[model samples]
Target: GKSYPTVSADYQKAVEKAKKKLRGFIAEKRCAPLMLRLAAHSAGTFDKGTKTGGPFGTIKHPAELAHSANNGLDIAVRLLEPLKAEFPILSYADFYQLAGVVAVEVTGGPEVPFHPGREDKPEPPPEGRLPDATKGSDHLRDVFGKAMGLTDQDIVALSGGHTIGAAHKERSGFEGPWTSNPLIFDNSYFTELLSGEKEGLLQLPSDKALLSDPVFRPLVDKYAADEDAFFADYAEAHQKLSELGFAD
Candidate 1:
């Protein structure tokens, strides 16, 4: 593993070129949302109990290539493949995490602090580590809180990511976008969640449950009302999510 205290100018330029390539191919297709989810899923496999399966770029492993949860991600991986050829010095692990960071910034969100030190694993971790969208608040707590050691505030902040992406029926067995403006990443997700309109909005059970539960409700209310708070908390939480299953 290589330690980078800060990203180099050459690396940033390479990433900007890759982002341009991503926009050329997937921008109108709602690429930012997919990149956000891709980053989350790629790193979301961490189990505090076992400390395995964080964003080590094993999502490119053959086992992950066929994993049901990873459906539709091959397109994302293929979208980022050119970066490997152009910047042979960067590892796949760094590329995966970097794609996530760039996704947020390009989507009009706050910049995520990143340091490159991860190395790809020889094998993929066991699947089924990500949270189920169809489940409830308790499940959210169990997955993001207990399993990942995130706070309720962090859970709500992370959920704000729903701001940019839509659910694909073929992939997650759900369909439609959560907000009217799915391409722009902002606090509109929390606003929509609390809007009470409830018509034509594609909210998963877990998404709705954020406001229903007492523990998660206050933070939901906070983020819904405050965009600055959402951006700050979301940046911290996203960074924490990226840090899971990595060693110092």
Candidate 2:
């Protein structure tokens, strides 16, 4: 694993080019929401599909259209064509992940240590790699745990990601980012879920299960009650997502 102390200028330049393209996306507005989701959604595709579910450092067939996790990402991929026009150095998969990494940084979240090692692969993923969003807590645990090698506590940490990005009605059919500060990264998602605030934000049946199931609800509420813990956990989870495989 790499430390946060520094990044080479070469890395900075490459990332800057990608981020510049994403900055222009701000003007388009039409694609920003989905593009952000593209990265999260790609990362979200881990349904015990083995480690290959991680971005795979490429965007070729099978994984893109075939993966159930990518259901809503077509919106982002379509916009990527134009982005690729300006920054051909980055692949579609790389661009999507970078968009998310930069979004977190630009919006006052963690640095999310990332690099441009992704390559454009041609092979597609096997079928049955994505998770079923309609399933209950057991499925949630198994899917994520297998996808990410995370525990119940870790799932709670990752779910906190919902706090920043809104869900799309057409995409997940869940609708809306999880908190009012959807644009800004914060711990409110955890806090509110536990507090039972019901501040008018709707939860997907999957999310509601976190509260209903005694096994997971309390941990969700604890992260909600403790912002520092949430931030720390999120930082670690982001790092894990960014760096899933390498020499140990």
Candidate 3:
């Protein structure tokens, strides 16, 4: 997905403004956590009825505060809090998701096509959409897949986001970042898992099940073994996620 020049004014403003706010964050070297915060916040909004959350929400309005998926996202929210005044128009929803977008751009991940204008939900999403770490691959699929209306392939592509970030004991009850280059977005997430490097990080029950199950194992292996393939498909799915329920 491409960034449009027409929206560049706000886009650039959002980008530069976020950059300035994040300068110390990257300096302090806690930006990876922020990236996951961005994902979790955006991920929290996948409402089945309206499809209203995600990167498009303009006013963050405590979406992160309410998401069960966001159990450990306060770190990112707090990191972004210092810059709330700089771009008052940008919501926490946008900030967090945009942080992920910006992190991808800065780290050489493909352009995750996004459009502005995300407004906050009047209320938080209903419970039970978020994946339970205790569940297996089928459980993860049943939960996130149904929420996103994704097929198995789509689910695999979306899970590509996990290629970079890891589960933190404090955050998700899992340990380690996704890849050695967790800070840098790459296909290594797929690569490492295919190579059985689940050791570098602690795998949640869901991740472990992906490896153990025959049906799901191939999908996980496909992503992990082929970095280029993962990126190509990830870029496509990322755009699909970004544009869901929105128009050009």
Model 3, stretches more than 4 Å misplaced? 1-28, 50-69, 197-199, 212-216, 243-248
lDDT of 3: 0.61
Model 2 residue 35 CA deviation in Å: 3.0
TM-score of each: 0.89, 0.78, 0.77
CA displacement after TM-score superposition, residue 136 of candidate 3 (Å): 2.1
On lDDT, the candidate that comes out on top is 1
Candidate order by TM-score, decreasing, is 1, 2, 3
The residue pairs that clash in candidate 1, if any, are none
Q: Alpha-carbon error at 167 in model 3, in Å?
A: 2.4
* lDDT (Cα, tens digit) per residue for candidate 2, span 113-207: 66665554455555554456677788777766766566777667777777766766765576666787776677877666766647567566676
Stretches of candidate 1 exceeding 4 Å from the true structure: 1-30
* Model 2 segments more than 4 A misplaced: 1-12, 20-33, 46-51, 57-63, 66-69, 197-199, 212-215, 246-248
Q: List, residue by residue over 31-89, the lDDT tens digit for candidate 1.
A: 77777787888887877888777888888776886888788888888877765677665
